[PDB]
Design a protein around this ligand. Structure first.
Ligand SMILES: [Mn+2]
Length: 546
């Protein structure tokens, strides 16, 4: 291998960071709801029924898809259903579900539930909620009153019983496999030199290039390397019986690394090797369809399937996501009273871009905080009689920034719009510090809050340096940040801040960010993808924190 200790050191440093950012990546989470009911009644009388719960998925257009259907419990005054419903959990979307309980006619006592027509059974009642509402309860159990439409009666509308939903993250979806590889007698292609070897584990595609899934650090002048542990979830590999590619390569600082050897084996195959203590010989390709078995061998020194502490594990341990908002009130935007102002409050009730982004994000994150007291700021405006503020409370107080609910944010916003003077220029430093001050204070008081600040701007920032410095400093606190650009401005300068598109942030004082905490996108939903990254950031913090 050709490279300096410095070239190696730094490619390893790049890897460490990338791993902490992707985490024990990609155990895409699944929930098991299980069901039971009490007091099922078509009218005012409770007698043995034959209950069945049926679960629909509510689309935004309010359309209903059937996604599950319990078995029929026979002759019961309180059924406890055996059949569980496994639904995927998507942190980035509200998953509205609708539950419907039916009293199955007795003539069907021998029918498989799949075969039942619901028109032919007694509809007892219905309830609705988001998945988010069930998995954020301490007991992970909700109790919902089944209701029917009796015509029109929000108060004295009769009950038809209670439906009781228990949610549990499914064990299989929490499993990752730690592996420690070791090789034996590696030969570099570069003759008369020792190898600087690393390993790449790649999922197999059919008729296209294999997708790298994991990578070991590079070791200097080692012919019998024992790497640090790499971790693999089942979704990264496919199934435990799915063959993967393991390539051993010789590192070259010039970026073109040379293949040392390659084997193809499943994660199951590796386990058998581990237990047996046996190694397997590597191969190189030679003839466009033949391979050569090397003297060099691969070994699996360690191999442990573990239950990884997942996002949902933390939520069930009483950890919250607390939403914060900061809104550009720079004149960039145009007078609120102008139809083509980005802050125009349409009389018809149509949301502007700031309202859209607030809802798109808040609507989801509101379920992960129990108090729903959300700090709300504006920046770049002149309040009555004062100079320009770069962090004033939207609610218009002097002492506190919290507002009640998304609703509270929306009314604080429309309120501020007509009680201050859009000014300038566009600065992010002060709000980020304000947020950090709150994060920090929460950390010191041993709270279990992690904070998500949404910043919405119409142009590019002025204080790019003092922003980096604030972010870098914030990276140690329980705080993620999402920036959303609105209107048609050129946001090119913003992309240096994005976790994905940008680069690891450097303080002016030289210090580096512990982790990626910023994302940016232009609201040309596109928000969904911003939300999808937060769990990872969330967990990164929890790993790193000290
Ligand atoms: Mn602006």
């Amino acid at each position: 291998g050709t490279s300096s200790m410095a070239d190696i050191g730094s490619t390893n440093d790049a890897l460490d960071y990338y791993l902490k950012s992707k985490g024990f990546n990609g155990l895409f989470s699944q929930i098991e709801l299980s069901f039971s009911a009490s007091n099922l009644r078509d009218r005012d009388v409770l007698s043995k029924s034959d209950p069945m719960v049926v679960v629909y998925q509510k689309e935004k257009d309010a359309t209903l898809s059937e996604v599950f259907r319990s078995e029929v419990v026979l002759n019961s005054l309180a059924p406890k259903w055996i059949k569980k419903f496994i639904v995927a959990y998507h942190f980035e979307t509200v998953q509205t579900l609708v539950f419907r309980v039916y009293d199955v006619d007795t003539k069907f006592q021998n029918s498989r539930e799949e075969m039942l027509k619901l028109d032919e059974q007694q509809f007892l009642g219905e309830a609705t909620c988001a998945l988010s509402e069930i998995i954020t309860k301490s007991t992970r159990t909700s109790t919902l009153e089944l209701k029917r439409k009796d015509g029109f009666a929000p108060q004295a509308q009769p009950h038809h019983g209670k439906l009781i939903i228990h949610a549990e993250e499914s064990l299989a979806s929490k499993i990752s496999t730690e592996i420690v590889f070791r090789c034996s007698n590696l030969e570099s292609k570069d003759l008369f030199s020792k190898s600087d070897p690393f390993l790449v584990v790649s999922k197999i595609v059919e008729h296209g290039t294999p997708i790298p899934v994991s990578k070991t650090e590079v070791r200097k002048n080692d012919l019998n390397p024992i790497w640090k542990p790499v971790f693999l979830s089942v979704q990264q590999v496919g199934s435990k019986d799915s063959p993967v590619i393991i390539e051993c390569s010789d590192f070259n600082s010039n970026g073109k690394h040379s293949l040392i050897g390659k084997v193809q084996k499943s994660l199951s195959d590796l386990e058998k090797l581990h237990l047996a203590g046996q190694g397997i010989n590597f191969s190189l390709p030679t003839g466009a369809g033949q391979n050569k078995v090397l003297k060099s061998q691969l070994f699996v020194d360690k191999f442990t399937e573990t239950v990884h502490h997942t996002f949902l594990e933390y939520l069930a341990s009483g950890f919250e996501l607390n939403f914060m908002v900061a809104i550009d009130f720079t004149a960039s935007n145009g007078n609120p009273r102008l139809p083509d102002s980005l802050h125009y409050i349409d009389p018809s009730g149509r949301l502007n871009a700031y309202q859209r982004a607030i809802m798109d994000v808040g609507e989801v994150l509101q379920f992960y905080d129990s108090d729903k007291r959300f700090p709300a700021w504006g920046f770049g405006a002149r309040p009555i009689d004062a100079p320009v503020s770069h962090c004033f409370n939207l609610n218009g107080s002097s002492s506190y920034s919290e507002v009640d609910g998304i609703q509270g944010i929306m009314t604080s916003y429309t309120s501020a719009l007509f009680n201050v003077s859009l000014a300038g220029p566009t600065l992010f430093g002060p709000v980020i510090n304000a947020a950090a001050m709150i994060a920090s204070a929460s950390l010191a008081q041993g709270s279990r809050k992690y904070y998500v600040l949404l910043i919405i701007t119409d142009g590019v920032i002025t204080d790019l340096q003092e922003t980096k410095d604030a972010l870098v400093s914030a990276s140690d606190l329980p705080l993620s940040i999402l920036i959303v650009g609105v209107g048609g401005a050129d946001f090119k300068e913003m992309e240096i801040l994005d976790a994905d598109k940008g680069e690891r942030l450097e303080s002016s004082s030289g210090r580096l960010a512990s982790r990626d905490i910023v994302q940016f996108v232009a609201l040309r939903s596109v928000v969904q993808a911003l939300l999808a990254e937060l769990p990872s950031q969330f967990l990164t913090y929890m790993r790193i924190r000290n």
